[PDB]
Structure formats: C-alpha cells, structure tokens
RNA sequence: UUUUUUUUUU
C-alpha cells in the first residue's frame, strides 16, 4: 500500500553527487527509472526577482533505487552535469515528478538549456482535484498536501538563513543543509503513490500530465518568463483548469462553490462534531487534540 | 480553545 511504501521512502539516505565518477553512477541508476521525483535548490536572491537564483543542487529520487541523489551542480558545473542528464530529462518515457514545476523548469531551461518531457506536477494534481470537487484553484504548500493526501506531518538554521545571503553557495554544505535539500523529493515520490494510478482519485493522470506539459511549455522558453501563467503565484489558472480538467465542482447539497457535501455547514445545520474529540466547531483534520502541533 | 482553518517555488 501507499502507506507502508511511505515508511520505506522516508528512510532513503541522501548521497551527494559532486564528482564525475559519482555522476556517472547516478545517471546509470536514474536511467532505469520509470518515475523520478525532482527538486532544485538555488541561491537565494531578492524578493522582487521571481526567477530562481543560481542553481546549487538538483535533487532526484526514483523508483530505481532507495536513495536521494543530491547533484552538486555548483561543484560539477552545469556543463558537466547536463552532459548525460539532459537525455534523461528529455525522455518522455520516464515520468519526472515535481511539486510546483514552474520556477524549476524556468531554471532548467535558462540556466541548463534543458526542457524536461514527461512531467507531472503533483501540486497541480492536488489543485485539479480541488477544482473538480469544489472549483478551488489554490496551490497548496507541500506540508498541507502531505497531510491531506498521506496523513503525514513532516531544518531550522537553514530556514533561519533562508526566509530571513545566497544560503546554498557554501561548500561543503553542512549535513543538515543536505538533509533539508533531500526532504522534498522523498515526499514527492511517496505522494505519487497516493495520487498516480489510484483508481479512486477523481482526476485522470493523463489530464494532469497534459496540464503540466502546458506549464512546461510556458516556463521552459530559454529566457526568464515575462508574463506569468497564473494570475497570482499561489493559484492555478482557471482557464487552464477548465480546458484540461473540465468544469469545476461544487457542493451537491447547497450548490455553493468552495466545499463539498461532506463539509457543508448547511447540511450539518449546527449538528456536526469533530470525529476525534467530539466537540462542535472544528473538524478532525484541524483538531488540536488529535494534532497538538496545530496549537 | 478552531473554518470551509494552508509555506506557490527558492
Ligand atoms: Ca521545490
Ligand atoms: Ca526543496
Ligand atoms: Zn454546501
Ligand atoms: Zn477535535
């Protein structure tokens, strides 16, 4: 099951790929994959610049090996790194899994001259589900998607230097920077087990692949993107959702957009209770007893 | 103690 498979994936060690010898081995491993989760860490810039800064790490985790590769592009140089990786990134027969591909794909194209093919954006997948059920086009962050899809609740000094300096320029990278960089692709690969090939997910993977391909066409143009595809960063263009996914949904009980029948305040009519602690006024997903980290 | 309760990526 996806739940037991998740525990294995979360134990995958990282491996820094920072020499030509290490790179050849990593490429050979990824060459045998069917799906490769990808992520990028880049030099932090200023708030105004939307483009990623200079690529520092490209992270990969595939179904071919229980490891997270941390490609040290800064040390290898882009020229060395892209030599054989470009063919794999361009191979439509290997699915590349992202969580918000937009900035990543822009950086791959601008900085590396590579345009991936066979891409599936799991953040978009999750949004497309919310769109079909509720006419919601919000992009949710990794933490929210992890909790809602896999029930998982997933470091500091990295966030301290980051949110508040390039950050990712220092070499050697401290262990906790490497582990920080390693985390997302583990989560991406495990999330794919829940979202992809799940008969009971109500959006077709092919539809989301096509929608993701549109994002790659928009953002992988060999130069910084002028006009964003989404009206604000934390949403998915409604017109693209209408085109690739279909009409947005709403509550079967009251007809409103934004929620489903199972969540309807009107159908619950003041009588619903938290399924964990039993009190009125909140859901199990947001219960402070079940989830004290929400206090 | 709670709302349709959310880190878009870096
Ligand atoms: Ca990312
Ligand atoms: Ca990341
Ligand atoms: Zn309703
Ligand atoms: Zn509760």
Numbering used by the authors: 42 to 195, 199 to 208, 211 to 341
From the paper:
Compared to TbREX1, TbREX2 and TbDSS-1, TbRND is unique, as it belongs to the RNase D (RND) group within the DEDD exoribonuclease superfamily. Like E. coli RNase D (EcRND), Saccharomyces cerevisiae Rrp6 (ScRrp6), and all other RND family proteins, TbRND possesses a single 3′-5′ exoribonuclease (Exo) domain. EcRND and ScRrp6 possess an HRDC (helicase and RNase D C-terminal) domain at the C-termini whereas TbRND contains a predicted CCHC zinc-finger domain (ZFD) at its C-terminus. Depletion of TbRND results in extended gRNA tails in vivo, whereas, overexpression of TbRND leads to a substantial reduction in the total gRNA population and the subsequent inhibition of mRNA editing.
Although no crystals grew for the mixture of RNA and RND-WT, we successfully solved the structure for a complex of RNA-12U bound to the TbRND ΔZF_3–4 mutant (amino acids 41–341), a truncation in which ZF3 and ZF4 were deleted. The structure was termed ΔZF_3–4/RNA-12U and refined to high resolution (1.77 Å). Of the 12 nucleotides in RNA-12U, 10 were well-ordered and labeled R0 to R9 from the 3′ end. The Zinc fingers, ZF1 and ZF2, of TbRND mainly interact with the nucleotides at the R5–R9 region. Although RND-Exo alone does not show clear RNA1-binding affinity in vitro, the Exo domain forms extensive interactions with the RNA in the ΔZF_3–4/RNA-12U complex structure, mainly recognizing nucleotides R0-R4 located at the 3′-end of RNA-12U. The crystals of the ΔZF_3–4/RNA-12U complex were grown in the presence of 10 mM CaCl2. In the structure, two well-defined Ca2+ ions were captured in the active site in a hexacoordinated octahedral-like geometry. The A-site ion is coordinated by the side chains of the Asp80, Glu82, and Asp230 residues, as well as the OP1 atom of R0 and two water molecules. The B-site ion is coordinated by the side chain of Asp80, the OP1 atom of R0, and three water molecules. Several structures were determined, including a ΔZF_3–4/RNA-12U complex, which represents the first ternary structure composed of native RND protein, substrate RNA, and coordinating cations.
